[PDB]
């Protein structure tokens, strides 16, 4: 199934580049990929479905693009800058799944298979940050205490991360990704006393 | 015409919630709000053109019920912390104007008219934030100087704030609201002398 699948997505991806979504038919998608509506409905059920399925390949070439603390190489101490420069250089691309990604996160959607892919997507950003965090705390933290600072780092870390794809979206010009993730870095270095104090008055 | 335009949005915003924007049809305004199709077009031009509006009417609104600096009361010392506490209170409520907001900005509107939309109320956002955040800095920094730690120092705000959005949307019941704009305050209180230091390289 899966090389039938790739040849639909590519297809629709640069029909909706070039149509936009509404004038881009199943039709069409079948003239650029030769697979007929019938074998393009069998894999994806709708239009909706196609479109939240592009969103999801694109997200998932995104993550295998950064590297896991424990696949980044060089010094330890440096993970996580490592980690951070690929985050940089893929972000500052301004790359499309994320725009579908919002998007399909504020519609309505009417197809409900969508809401899984947006869920899913999600939860693997949301991992990958906590994954990256854990090694900015101290070692000597308990760990139930530091499973706390983590999540509320990553929360922030998240929100930030979201808020610079927008800033590349409405104000491209004026919008360094680079420096923007440097803020973040330093914000988070900031944050981590306040939160172990904060967590104090447990 | 500005109170028929009251009537129309009010219609629509009710009947978008309900039925959906695509099973909204401008005939089901006009049943609404006693507006003929023909009076809807004149004002708005289109179904597209009555979304943006709402979404303009629904963040004028918002930001009309946070103070501007000048507009707060109290010790001078306290009015950033008025400013806050009315955007916390305001973002708890996951007005439905930002998802318009965010969504609008991400799409590729057909109607041309959406994106002047989009900016105006962009804009509004980062003058806001900046606004506010002036009052961050000590006040002998020399004005051009101060002018790009509050310009950086404001992108940071506004991509935050507009990841708080997204985490209640998407993880509404771990998200605490007040708590991560205490969190960009905090962050932001650390970077002011980051900024200036990182500046002098000039
Ligand atoms: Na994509
Ligand atoms: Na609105």
Redesign the interface.
């Given at each position: 199934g899966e090389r039938s699948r790739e040849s639909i997505l590519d297809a629709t991806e640069r029909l909706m580049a070039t149509k936009?979504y509404?004038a881009t038919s199943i039709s069409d998608i079948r003239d650029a990929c030769g697979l007929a509506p019938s074998s393009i409905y069998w894999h994806f059920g709708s239009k909706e479905g196609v479109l939240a399925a592009m969103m999801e390949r694109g997200a998932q070439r995104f993550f295998a693009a950064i590297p896991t603390w424990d696949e980044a190489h060089g010094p330890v101490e440096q993970r996580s800058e490592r980690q951070l420069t690929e985050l940089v250089s893929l972000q500052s691309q301004h790359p499309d799944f994320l725009?579908?990604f919002?998007?399909l996160?504020?519609?309505?959607s009417?197809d409900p298979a969508v809401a899984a892919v947006?869920?899913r997507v999600?939860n693997t950003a949301?991992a990958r940050f906590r994954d990256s965090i854990t090694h900015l705390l101290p070692s000597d933290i308990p760990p139930g205490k530091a499973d706390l600072v983590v999540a509320?780092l990553t929360?922030?870390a998240?929100?930030?991360?979201?808020?610079?794809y927008?800033?590349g979206?409405?104000?491209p010009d004026?919008?360094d990704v680079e420096?923007?993730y440097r803020?973040l870095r330093?914000?988070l270095e900031?944050?981590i006393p306040?939160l172990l104090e904060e967590t104090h008055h447990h």
């Open positions: 936009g509404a725009r579908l919002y998007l996160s504020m519609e309505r009417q947006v869920r999600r949301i509320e929360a922030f998240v929100a930030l991360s979201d808020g610079v927008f800033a979206h409405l104000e004026t919008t420096r923007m803020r330093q914000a900031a944050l306040v």
